[PDB]
Symmetry: D2
Subunit: 116 residues, 4 copies
Amino acid sequence: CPLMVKVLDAVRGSPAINVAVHVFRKAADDTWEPFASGKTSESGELHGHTTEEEFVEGIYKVEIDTKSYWKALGISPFHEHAEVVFTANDSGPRRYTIAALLSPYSYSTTAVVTNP
Amino acid sequence: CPLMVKVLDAVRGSPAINVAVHVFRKAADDTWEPFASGKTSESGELHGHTTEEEFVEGIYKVEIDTKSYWKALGISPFHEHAEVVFTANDSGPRRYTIAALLSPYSYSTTAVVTNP
Amino acid sequence: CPLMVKVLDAVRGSPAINVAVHVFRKAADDTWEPFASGKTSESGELHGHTTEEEFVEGIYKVEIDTKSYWKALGISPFHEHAEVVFTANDSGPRRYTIAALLSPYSYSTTAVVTNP
Amino acid sequence: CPLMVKVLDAVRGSPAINVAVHVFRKAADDTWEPFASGKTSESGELHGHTTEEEFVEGIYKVEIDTKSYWKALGISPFHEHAEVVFTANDSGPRRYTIAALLSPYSYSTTAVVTNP
């Protein structure tokens, strides 16, 4: 799976488990088309069964449901979710790891792109 | 102004100047209505000329045109833009500063929420 | 003051107030001589009452007492403190802002370096 | 190896390879005693042959030679190095992953602590 998402909790110093993640790809008509979704595992990693074949060039959006994550822990956070929008595979197939680091009023997101 | 945006550049160690920023209010019909927009100043700040009265409770989106910023500096960026979505003024009007620190393959965002 | 420190709290969405900060100059004998110190203000800033003349080129260390800050808020922290080491004024006197954004298990630091 | 260090480059969106890392443990007399050192691999991960046995409770320091990393890529960075100081194993053995994300004028460091 050439698209991996990893989410960490900066308050607890742990993977952020059970976090809902939705992935969309921008379609010809400018709308977001559903692409993949899942929940993070005990390692904070998203369970993607995406193939290299269907992962074509385009603009992708990864939406991480951070608000429900914090709410379940009793915390009322600032952000509704964390969104990451990026062009993928514009110069050939790559493997992408989108990392998100979560705090109640702050998040950071980083991408590592490798050419296998 | 109850809603300020500040953008910093982690590569140059400076404010991010002349970056386009668009703010939207979510409308009843889950659609994003324009709310404020501009280019960041030499201090990396976006004016915000909105008043407390029009800045009612609701879900706001702040969209930062990070891709144009990096292209103008000649560095290849990962993200299409940086989008921050949050609920404002629940528990009453505060001053919000949305701060964003930019790198080509990473960004972080934090809210500094202060009660006057 | 050519050297300012600003500290933000990612959990509360606010400046980090009353945080101890110590600044040192490296001495010829690779030893850290005290240079400035204080507690951050309500805006999360450390006064810095040093003058341009005493703020000569050299390697400076900024030590932020993050562990006491988190203990005062009742949250278990990871780090003993946050230490930023940098060379200043090579290429001439600038204004330096060392900004630090704190979470219990994570911190980031950035320099906003501006030429007057 | 219950102590792992992973370093990423936020300019290139890649692991930071060949980065020197030194690890110290605070000794009885208050001085830093050398504990481990190495260079990051092609995955940005540090090659530690540390055992659970020798990794006792104490205060550890991880020093990452960020300046040499940037210099080798032609960039003159702000920081001399990135230091992470923390108490380990104070409540029993844990596995620690220290992650550092590097930009020329900024870095962030995060810890994930797991109980195996």
